[PDB]
Each structure stands twice: as C-alpha cells, then as structure tokens.
Amino acid sequence: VVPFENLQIEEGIITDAEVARFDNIRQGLDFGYGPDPLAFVRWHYDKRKNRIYAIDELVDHKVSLKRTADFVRKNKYESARIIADSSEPRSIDALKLEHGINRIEGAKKGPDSVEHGERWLDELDAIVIDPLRTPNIAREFENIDYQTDKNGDPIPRLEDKDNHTIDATRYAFERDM
Ligand SMILES: [Mn+2]
Ligand SMILES: [Mn+2]
C-alpha cells in the first residue's frame, strides 16, 4: 500500500566525509519531455549492506544537454558511467559526440522492467537521502505512491508522475539486478 518504507531522509544525514569515501558510484539520466524535466542522479551503492546513498542530482525543466554536460564535467562526474533513458538515442549521441560525456550509454532494459526495477529499489535495506544535497530525489521518493486500478485498489506499479529521479535511479542500477 505504501512504497519505499526503506527511505532514510534527513538534512545532514550524509556528511562531506562520507561523500568523499563513496567509491561505488551509479549514475542515471532521464531526459524529460513536454512539462517533464531532465533528471541526472548520482548514487553510491553499498552492496555489502544493501543500501544506496544519494550523492548529487541535476533536475532541469528547460532541457539543455550542454548544461547537463557542463555540470557533470565541472563536478568531475564523467569518470563514472551514466546509464540514460534509451527513448532519446540522439540525445545520448549528442552528450557523447557533441559534449564529451564519453561514458554515457542507453538503458538496455525495456518498458517491461519498470515494475521490476521499482521492486528492486523497494527491497533495498535502506535508501539514504540528504535533502540538502539532493532535494528533488528527496521530494519524489518521499511522495510517490502506487497506481490504483479500476476499482481503486493499489497495484504493483508506481505512479508515472513526478518520478524523474526515480526513473533515473532505476536506469543507474539496472546492471546491478
Ligand atoms: Mn525518461
Ligand atoms: Mn521523466
């Protein structure tokens, strides 16, 4: 009935010391469309405790691949791989050939895995989010509900709304499943 019971959300929950130690990065990108924004996400993954930690984000309603590229490079986030929304193959091309993000690549998994990717995140021991670092990830994950069906009963799919960092996280971890 209520998803992501595993959330840990508090301002300051991730210190700068911790961020420095994080050495197992996963990054994802949803591209945005119409009213929907571009969402880049960067996480650290603790496989031995089954937890993920939100390190940084970029959410942008006025979608600019240049600006997204400038941000990734400015912060030195291009040493790590980015798994991107594969519905925009030319946006992926552009980041790579146009803007120098060499380690960007398309989500291999299809639209018949959303449900499973969402379950995988949901079954993590903990999803740790500092709203001072990643406030959009915090808002989305905190407020996202399950879709309800014809009757009004809940179903195993998250709402397809205000879920851009969620999607982006799903892409980021798709090889870890
Ligand atoms: Mn998308
Ligand atoms: Mn989206």
DSSP code for 37: P
| β-strand partners of 58 | 40
Distance 6 CA to ligand 1 centre (A): 24
46 is in an annotated binding site: no
Residue that is written with structure tokens 């982006």 in the block: 168
Backbone φ and ψ for 157, nearest 5 degrees, come out as -120, 135
Pairwise CA distance, residues 173 & 177, whole Å: 7
164 is in an annotated binding site: yes
Method by which this entry was solved = X-ray
Pairwise CA distance, residues 74 & 56, whole Å: 13
DSSP code for 97: I
Distance 48 CA to ligand 2 centre (A): 30
Measure Cα distances from 105 to 60, 85, 111, 146 in Å.
Answer: 20, 9, 17, 29
Tell me the CATH architecture of domain 1-176. Answer: 2-Layer Sandwich (3.30)
Q: Dump strand ranges (E) for the chain.
A: 7-9, 25-30, 38-46, 51-60, 82-84, 104-106, 126-129, 146-148, 154-158
CB burial readout 142-174, b (16+ within 10 A) else e: eebebeeeeeeeeeeebeeeebbbbbbbbbbbb
Pairwise CA distance, residues 103 & 170, whole Å: 17
Distance 108 CA to ligand 2 centre (A): 17
| β-strand partners of 36 | 33
Tokens encoding 137? 């990830």
Helix axes 135-143, 164-172, angle to 10 degrees: 100
CB neighbourhood size of 121 (10 A): 20
**Under 8 Å CB-to-CB from 148, ≥6 apart: which residues?**
154, 155
